[PDB]
RNA sequence: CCGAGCGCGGGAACAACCGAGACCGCCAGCUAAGGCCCCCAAGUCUGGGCUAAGUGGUAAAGGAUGUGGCGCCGCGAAGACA
RNA sequence: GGGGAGGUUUGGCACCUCGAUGUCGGCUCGUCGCAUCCUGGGGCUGAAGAAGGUCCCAAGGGUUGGGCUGUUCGCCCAUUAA
RNA sequence: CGGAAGGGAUAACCGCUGAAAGCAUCUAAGCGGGAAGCCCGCCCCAAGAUGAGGCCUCCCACGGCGUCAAGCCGGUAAGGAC
């Protein structure tokens, strides 16, 4: 029932405990609290939380900077935590230490257009024997006059990538308050230089 | 026996009753267990 | 001669309850209100049958054991993807999609019947939004 | 009924003597009411249903009475071995052969009664928490299976024939 | 009968099943079948009798302390039925 | 000895398609049925226990890899919760 | 790393009270337990949900024609575009 922002740093192996370790660091960042969401006005219970501050004259207009308690912009938007009310402060990562195990949501790599074969994972045939033809090819689909139609979401040749990821339960290894750092059990979605979120997980009771 | 689509009283103590909408053979012996089906 | 020809009347708004009521006979005669066929100025291609504000459908009656028994289907177009709630269910959770989608078998189909359906707006409290008259009927 | 102070109501019937309190929710298909000491049970009409209603609601206002009139007997026993029926704290923990042993609360309406344990009685004015609590407990360990052990209301011990059968 | 009446009303749809032999016009009434809550036009008409399963809304022998009226045949205030 | 169910077998009829409906097996993608192969809940037992037996309930998921044949099927091989 | 855990009514089945029917009976009104099934809770799309939602801030009132009742037009403000 918590959360925190970040970004994509590394993916290493920290030799811990004796053993290694393939670790995805985020820097989680000074994010602040900012506009706040109530059920009664908004309809549910979330935080408002900014990135990195970098904003001046190419920002412009509003401002949370209105707010009530400003800090301007970070340098790319904000984002809401559900289930979230912190007690009137920024945060960064010291809510969290080792040993709470939390899903990390973030933004995934692109593949563009993809072929059926390195998407849905098929054959596409022999290398040789039959025909050159298709050997990578989505074989076929339904049945002949009945069915008489195609599936609405049948598996097929089409994007893969430009999508919204939440993977689930890490080990946080450790957190550097000192600075920004939230290190866990290597995994997370996107580029070792894209936007990526913290949330507390769900386990046992 | 459970489940036959003939179900009757065996002895002098097997005796008939309705459930749930479907007709179940008693008796204390379970031996003689039956209901319609 | 030539027969008569309603101007732009006045779309008259009424209300009724909802409880005590059969699931059945209720929407049967509010839907053929929607149509202008309990006014004596009726005309099939022009909708200017009232609007209903129902109150309270939460409380709604019905015959049968339907209660558990009556099953509403819906079918999303993806294969497998036939949904079956009952009327049980639908009570518990958003209850007014009973007496709504009701009626909406009782009209006509023509584009108009639609925009009819829209004149009708359910509600399981009562309560609504006062907007005007909404004398009341039986 | 003279620890008894009744009450008659639409549906449910609100009655009151020396134990606790006890409400029984009659389909008013015939209407009771205090008359006298002992109540009427009379029908609208001669029909099955009918029938079954007043004989059944006849009952239930009659466990209702001698239930405030203090009536809880729920018995119990136990015939295996080390099954033993502690009754320590105010839950009942009792180990029947079976890797661990099992608390019972005592809920609303209920208490228990260990005379020893051996054999074990619940207390409780109502006449659903008594074959329903019992029943769950009979239910935490099962009779006999062909030879003898477990738990039992106070029935008999039927067998199934020993060194044999297992062909 | 369809074919040559795939012209009309019913039967949801529907060559031959029901009604029905279509010169044209009519913003005139009766009626056939089939219907009369609504899609849809007209009775949520009057009175009595049934059924509780969606039966109605599509199958059998065969099984049953399902329900409601009819007929018979011994038992009982000298006291039966459980 | 009786009565059904289903429409995958072997087939009866010759209604659509002869101014063309590319008839077997394998591949790739599957899907829907339940009369369930396994898994899950259980009743009956000639069910001590373990294992089994049959019958109820129940598609959610799973339903391997090689030899021999164009082979579907089927026998074998090592496995299998299957 | 995910299936899960856990919540709610249930299938077959097993229990309580309980008449109809002095007895008995899971049932007719009344309850409780109880499936990998069922609605969830996790993952994602998603207000073209024409029903087009809600939150937060940012913006000036004829400018010259339409005199009433809807607008027309050439340039601005927040912005947005090439």
């Known amino acids: 029932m918590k959360g925190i922002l970040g970004v994509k740093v590394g993916m290493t192996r920290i030799f811990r405990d004796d053993r290694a370790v393939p670790v995805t660091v985020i820097l989680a960042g000074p994010c602040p609290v900012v506009q706040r969401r109530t059920p009664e006005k908004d309809g549910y219970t979330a935080v408002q939380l900014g990135f990195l501050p970098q904003n001046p004259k190419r920002v412009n207009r509003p401002l949370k900077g209105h707010f009530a308690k400003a800090g301007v912009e970070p340098v790319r938007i904000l984002r809401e935590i559900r289930d979230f009310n912190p007690e009137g402060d920024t945060v960064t990562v010291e809510i969290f230490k080792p040993g709470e195990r939390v899903d990390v949501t973030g933004t995934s790599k692109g593949r563009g257009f993809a072929g059926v074969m390195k998407r849905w994972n098929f054959a596409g045939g022999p290398d040789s024997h039959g025909a050159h033809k298709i050997h990578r090819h989505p074989g076929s689909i339904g049945n002949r006059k009945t069915p008489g139609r195609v599936y609405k979401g049948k598996k097929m040749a089409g994007h893969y990538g430009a999508e919204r990821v939440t993977v689930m339960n890490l080990e946080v290894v450790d957190v550097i308050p000192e600075e920004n750092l939230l290190l866990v059990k290597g995994a997370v979605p996107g580029p070792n230089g894209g936007l990526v979120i913290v949330r507390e997980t769900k386990k046992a009771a | 026996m459970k489940v036959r689509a003939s179900v009757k009283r065996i002895c002098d103590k097997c005796k008939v009753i309705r459930r749930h909408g479907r007709v179940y053979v008693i008796c204390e012996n379970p031996k003689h267990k039956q209901r319609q089906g | 001669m030539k027969t008569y020809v309603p101007k732009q009347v006045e779309p008259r708004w009424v209300l009724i309850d909802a409880e005590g009521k059969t699931l059945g006979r209720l929407a049967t005669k509010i839907a053929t209100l929607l149509r202008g066929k309990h006014r004596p100025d009726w005309t099939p291609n022009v909708a200017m049958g009232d609007f209903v504000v129902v109150v309270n459908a939460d409380k709604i009656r019905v015959t049968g054991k339907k209660l558990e028994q009556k099953i509403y289907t819906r079918y999303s177009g993806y294969p497998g993807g036939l949904k079956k709630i009952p009327l049980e269910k639908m009570l518990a959770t958003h209850p007014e999609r009973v007496l709504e989608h009701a009626v909406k078998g009782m009209l006509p189909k023509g584009p108009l019947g639609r925009r009819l359906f829209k004149r009708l707006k359910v509600y399981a409290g009562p309560d609504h939004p006062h907007q005007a008259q909404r004398p009341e009927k039986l | ?167």
């Open chain 4, 1 to 167: 009924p003279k620890g008894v102070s009744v009450e008659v109501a639409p549906g449910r019937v609100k009655v009151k003597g020396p134990k606790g309190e006890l409400e029984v929710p009659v389909s008013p298909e015939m209407r009771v009411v205090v008359e006298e000491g002992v109540v009427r049970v009379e029908r609208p009409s001669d029909e099955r249903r009918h029938k079954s209603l007043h004989g059944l609601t006849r009952t239930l206002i009659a466990n209702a009475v001698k239930g405030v009139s203090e009536g809880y007997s729920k018995e119990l026993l136990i015939k295996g071995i080390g099954y033993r029926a502690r009754l320590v704290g105010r839950a009942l923990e009792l180990t029947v052969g079976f890797s661990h042993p099992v608390v019972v609360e005592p809920p609303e309406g209920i208490t228990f009664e260990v005379p020893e344990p051996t054999r074990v009685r619940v207390s409780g004015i109502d006449k659903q928490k008594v074959g329903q609590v019992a029943a769950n407990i009979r239910a935490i360990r099962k009779p006999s299976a062909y030879h003898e052990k477990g738990i039992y209301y106070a029935g008999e011990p039927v067998r199934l024939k020993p060194g044999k059968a297992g062909a």
